[PDB]
């Protein structure tokens, strides 16, 4: 299925044109180990996203440890507390992780919608503030 993102090897494969290779701390192996997928755009060519909590990080430096960055920016991500390898998870555990991923993807869309609305509400509020002046 597309439970593929739970597989580290699938995650590593996303970093086809990730620029940070051998010599660096945030190599594709390390990024994939930490739960990241490479999601490059034009404004952000090193954009990476956790497959599980959906936190999006960019502006990577060579010395960045992906695990430490993931912890700093998204300290509650359940993926960070998975100590077993994928194949060692029980089905019950896997299913619970997959439910938690879905809850995470609702906190993410909700969050993006809130942000977008507030951008608009500020502009609107500003305009009406001017009218209320008389």
């Amino acid at each position: 299925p597309a439970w593929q993102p739970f597989l580290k090897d699938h995650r590593i494969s996303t970093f086809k044109n990730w620029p940070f290779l051998e010599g660096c701390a945030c190599t594709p192996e390390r990024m994939a180990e930490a739960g990241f997928i490479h999601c490059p755009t034009e404004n952000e060519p090193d954009l990476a996203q956790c497959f599980f909590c959906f936190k999006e990080l960019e502006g990577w430096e060579p010395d960045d440890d992906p695990i430490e960055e993931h912890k700093k920016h998204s300290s509650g991500c359940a993926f960070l507390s998975v100590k077993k390898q994928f194949e060692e998870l029980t089905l019950g555990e896997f299913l619970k992780l997959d439910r938690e991923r879905a809850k995470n993807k609702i906190a993410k869309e909700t969050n993006n919608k809130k942000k977008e609305f507030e951008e608009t509400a500020k502009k609107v509020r500003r305009a009406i503030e001017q009218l209320a002046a008389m």
Partner: peptide, 4 residues
């Protein structure tokens, strides 16, 4: 690294 830093947030979008």
């Amino acid at each position: 690294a830093r947030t979008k």
